[PDB]
Design a protein around this ligand. Sequence first.
Ligand SMILES: NCc1c[nH]c2nc(N)[nH]c(=O)c12
Ligand SMILES: NCc1c[nH]c2nc(N)[nH]c(=O)c12
Ligand SMILES: [Zn+2]
Ligand SMILES: [Zn+2]
Lengths: 365, 365
Amino acid sequence: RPRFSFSIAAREGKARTGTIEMKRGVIRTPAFMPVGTAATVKALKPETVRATGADIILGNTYHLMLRPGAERIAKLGGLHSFMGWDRPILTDSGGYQVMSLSSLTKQSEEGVTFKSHLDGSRHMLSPERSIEIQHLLGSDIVMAFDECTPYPATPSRAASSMERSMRWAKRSRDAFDSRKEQAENAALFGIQQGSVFENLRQQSADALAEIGFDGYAVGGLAVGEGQDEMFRVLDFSVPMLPDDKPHYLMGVGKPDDIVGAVERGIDMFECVGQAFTWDGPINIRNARFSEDLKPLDSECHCAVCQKWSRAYIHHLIRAGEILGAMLMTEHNIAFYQQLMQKIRDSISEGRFSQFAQDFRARYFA
Amino acid sequence: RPRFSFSIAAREGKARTGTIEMKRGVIRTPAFMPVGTAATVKALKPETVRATGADIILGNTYHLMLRPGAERIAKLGGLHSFMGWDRPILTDSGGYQVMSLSSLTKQSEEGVTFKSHLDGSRHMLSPERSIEIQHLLGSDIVMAFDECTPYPATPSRAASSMERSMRWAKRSRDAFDSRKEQAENAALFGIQQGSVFENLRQQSADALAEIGFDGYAVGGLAVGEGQDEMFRVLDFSVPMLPDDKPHYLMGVGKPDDIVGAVERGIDMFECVGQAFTWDGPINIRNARFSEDLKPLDSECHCAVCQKWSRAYIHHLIRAGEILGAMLMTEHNIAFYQQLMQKIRDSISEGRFSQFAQDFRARYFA
Ligand SMILES: NCc1c[nH]c2nc(N)[nH]c(=O)c12
Ligand SMILES: NCc1c[nH]c2nc(N)[nH]c(=O)c12
Ligand SMILES: [Zn+2]
Ligand SMILES: [Zn+2]
């Protein structure tokens, strides 16, 4: 029932477990957020997303502002009613996908203009318009509009981009705050930049803390630097952020990356023929599964593993059948939610370090 | 609980309503059978197919004998356990799709040899092998292997093909009967041929009745002759079949075709951006639905119409999202099951002629 309340129930090292309370529901942390692109978590009904244990989903902004359009979604009642998900939704700012999926983008201090990847339509995106679009969609957790930094990045370019990002973070803060219904009902997260440079991460964290946000993302990672480098940067970056607010690592979702990131103080993650299993991923298209009657994973509690075999799913995926996508997706998102649950429980019980060890021994065996 | 028992509970004119009792369940007639191709009713879990009200599904034989293979399905426990549908399955003989989807087919009195449409693999299909494959899949209702007749067809060619079909019907009968487990647990339907020729339909019906089957299909229609011609042929063809056994019209599923066919004594049908509504079909991709908050149909009891709007489904289909296929398919199969229910109830209440009238007035308004 409050607009936003993050409470930490238990800790182990840098790891934390707790809850974020919002108007539309409670979010258990560490949290994994399935991703909705074009107002759908691909191949799943929202009731099925919920059934896997998800407390919140991410809505990509870029595709919705192109199709079906933010204004139209607002006229139709907002994203939650449009897609039939009534729990929190975190929306991205749209900047990532502009720069990664759009064309003829022209960047400047005001923002970015671009042509979409689908048509030739002209479009504009600034801190102000991004916050507006997230409002029109009815987002619960709004992300500040930033300027991401390619990897690798020179210190000068990483600095310029981080600085611009902090200027846009203030503009984001003010746009959000000047819209009463959004300010009163949603939350706003700021994004830390700085590439792999500690001094720049520090300056960014300081700037963001000065402005003040409900949560802080670590942006700029998982863009080519490798897990070792990513963890090294997290080692010094996450402590710079306010302890008492949630920490979201953008673009990170491999099971092992999630475990090590939680070990480094991260609280929120998203979804980035592969099936996850506690013994490591499998590619279900491999011929070795064509007569395998076992479920995708031997322990998994999901409906898919209760009800269908590897052999059947192998057949469906090789045949390009939609049910194959449906089943593979339900299992994988369930597997991630079970990972998060095991993480939450082990932290609450002060045995997370052990969990991490055990998980890795078997997942890479 | 018996292998096969068809009981007629009520009649109106040539229309009948009742039940087929089989080991795996009861089938309400007139029945609409969703089609499973490659061991899946496209984009639906079997629990969802059931939820729409389906009592039985059709399994296409052709694709399964190519992928995943009949022998493999039998090793894995049969089609019902492979795909997770535990109720009756009617399997087609595979002949239709050979001739329509395969290559280098060489026909003869023994059967057909062909190369599949996917690979270059060589294959053979006779009455005996078709019955064997249906057994390997664990079919509850087995279709005799026939030689369908192109439309239009000359009387000589229609006669030759019908005669061959009756010879193969006997071979089908004997193959089925000589396999104890199949004979004791499954049912066998024969197929009437003869194109649009009354004398040939009569000879075929006689031949099939002499051999004896658990049910009789009307084959050879819905292959280009138009609804008027189709109904004209049904007018004289269906009475030639045994009254006390079910009558299956192959390849017929338009809602109006179903109503008129039931009016002519047919008991079983199958599935052949279009959404069915009681006011006629709509194409949900039309721009007129982009901000339409109404459900696909205003009366439909399905989960889709409870939970999502035209506008949302329009968006999903235009975006090529899998959930769009999922939702459109669940609604359409539910709509057909509701049509069948209204048909069964109106016959039981002696008001089917009125239902038919009313249905057509509004569906074509
Ligand atoms: N590189 C991490 C990442 C993934 N998606 C993101 N989107 C934005 N706007 N910024 C970011 O840093 C990220
Ligand atoms: N033309 C009706 C039809 C559809 N599918 C069928 N399959 C076979 N084997 N014979 C048939 O007559 C039909
Ligand atoms: Zn599973
Ligand atoms: Zn419906």
